Design a protein around this ligand. Sequence first.
Ligand SMILES: C[C@H]1O[C@@H](n2cnc3c(N)ncnc32)[C@H](O)[C@@H]1O
Ligand SMILES: C[C@H]1O[C@@H](n2cnc3c(N)ncnc32)[C@H](O)[C@@H]1O
Ligand SMILES: C[C@H]1O[C@@H](n2cnc3c(N)ncnc32)[C@H](O)[C@@H]1O
Ligand SMILES: [Mg+2]
Ligand SMILES: [Mg+2]
Ligand SMILES: [Mg+2]
Ligand SMILES: [Mg+2]
Ligand SMILES: [Mg+2]
Ligand SMILES: [Mg+2]
Lengths: 186, 186, 186
Amino acid sequence: VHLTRIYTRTGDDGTTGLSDMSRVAKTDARLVAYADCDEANAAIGAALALGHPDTQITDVLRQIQNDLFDAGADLSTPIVENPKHPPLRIAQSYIDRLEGWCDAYNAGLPALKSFVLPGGSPLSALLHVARTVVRRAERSAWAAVDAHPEGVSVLPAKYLNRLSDLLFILSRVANPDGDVLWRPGG
Amino acid sequence: VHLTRIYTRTGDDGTTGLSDMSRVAKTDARLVAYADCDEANAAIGAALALGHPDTQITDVLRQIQNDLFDAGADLSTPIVENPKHPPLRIAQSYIDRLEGWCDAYNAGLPALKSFVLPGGSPLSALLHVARTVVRRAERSAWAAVDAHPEGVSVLPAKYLNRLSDLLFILSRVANPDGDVLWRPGG
Amino acid sequence: VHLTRIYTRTGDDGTTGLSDMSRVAKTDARLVAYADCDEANAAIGAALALGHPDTQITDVLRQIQNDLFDAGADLSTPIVENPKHPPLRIAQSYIDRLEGWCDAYNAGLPALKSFVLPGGSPLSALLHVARTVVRRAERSAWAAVDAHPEGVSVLPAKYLNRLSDLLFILSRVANPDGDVLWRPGG
Ligand SMILES: C[C@H]1O[C@@H](n2cnc3c(N)ncnc32)[C@H](O)[C@@H]1O
Ligand SMILES: C[C@H]1O[C@@H](n2cnc3c(N)ncnc32)[C@H](O)[C@@H]1O
Ligand SMILES: C[C@H]1O[C@@H](n2cnc3c(N)ncnc32)[C@H](O)[C@@H]1O
Ligand SMILES: [Mg+2]
Ligand SMILES: [Mg+2]
Ligand SMILES: [Mg+2]
Ligand SMILES: [Mg+2]
Ligand SMILES: [Mg+2]
Ligand SMILES: [Mg+2]
């Protein structure tokens, strides 16, 4: 894929193209899903640029930013029988990796008896922002499945499901002293 | 409530649970409402972590972050007749408090004859971001009322209504010199 | 227009006013469109306040923040035949200006053979966040056209279309060394 002039004016009527170049409305549920992946990817970039994460988190998050483009390519390309070219799809491989990162980073942390108030470190607060945006993207991914239960894979949404759980764990690690707990009705 | 393993895989089919553990689609309007409260809460955490607010704003905003979890507990728990346990609900008490903070912080500021361009301080700009996210959450809260006018309270949405007004006032105070005014068609 | 008490309680029933003071639901597609313009405007303010953009970008972005209020005034005011007062509307003039900024700032940059991972500079990462929020606003603007193809202009949405292309170019310029490229399935 190529990024040259950037502005082509081909979407000035409110329509645009999926990856097979078929035309959709810019409100199409599939587009909203991989659009929200774009927005989640930018939230992680904000966390990387203002958060000063250590080397090992920067490598995990950079892989996730790359996975999010894999996920968008998946969502933007309709599923067809025997495609001429084999499409890039999300695989259980991706989710297993996320679960391993969850278990590893969640090992050294204790249980919580209530919700944490987002904030603390610049890195911890921005991971929380990214966490909520990924969760919004997950909802859009599931809505895309509802709209096209054959043409859209469930694996992008399952990836986004596990990812927001990992981002939560990482947000706690970025507050190595501890985060403030919600006190109901306090 | 307990946060332990974090990832349970019970939502890998696009369904999830309200606080009474009844099952809903992850696109359910009630969930979208308290999801957007989560996103607004994270925006305030970004304002607290990168904004360096003074002591008195940090205490006001920390209370709001706690109120937002009260509001989410409200929205996530259907209203029923004579519940076995009494549920945590938002009350006029919450909104009266917000109005007092509005009046107090708006006392020392002058009138405006047009809109302000968001920006200035890191604290002022991030309060504006939080302001717009809270307003998005308010719209979702009202949509939840439309979907379930008996099972959902109007008070969460009324809290979110007044809250975005307070966040605007606080955004001006964080620009103690003044913000740039919109000039129509300038 | 005047900003005085801020909180009027007139929207505590989930209704609110367009610029002609006619009443709409707070979920009205037109309101969602200029609400999303507000959210995009705040994202640019975050980019201006934490990004330390040079003088020439700050002047371009400040003009865009002003255009976004022009665009919201357009979207919030229904189109009518022979209005008593002439309404502020977006014009091709606005979009031509954006295209000139695109061409000028895109001149000194090379082609790309794949997507860039958002991040890098605080300014570059926050421009990416703003880029994705503007794109979300564009989708809402097109949905407003669908709901009211006579009462809503297409020009706000076309402005938002070109604007996200410009924000992308500016995000690259704020990484004068280069951004990381997506590697499919890497
Ligand atoms: C932790 C709680 O958050 C809600 N929940 C589950 N999935 C999402 C999502 N993608 N976005 C927002 N809220 C969600 C459910 O109610 C769950 O039980
Ligand atoms: C200030 C103006 O903003 C619009 N307005 C009112 N409530 C909201 C909301 N929750 N989110 C976005 N825009 C809103 C109405 O048009 C109001 O008059
Ligand atoms: C670059 C690709 O992004 C998708 N696209 C086009 N317009 C938007 C928008 N406003 N918001 C999100 N995604 C969009 C289309 O698929 C286009 O081809
Ligand atoms: Mg383009
Ligand atoms: Mg989940
Ligand atoms: Mg989970
Ligand atoms: Mg209001
Ligand atoms: Mg108000
Ligand atoms: Mg476009």
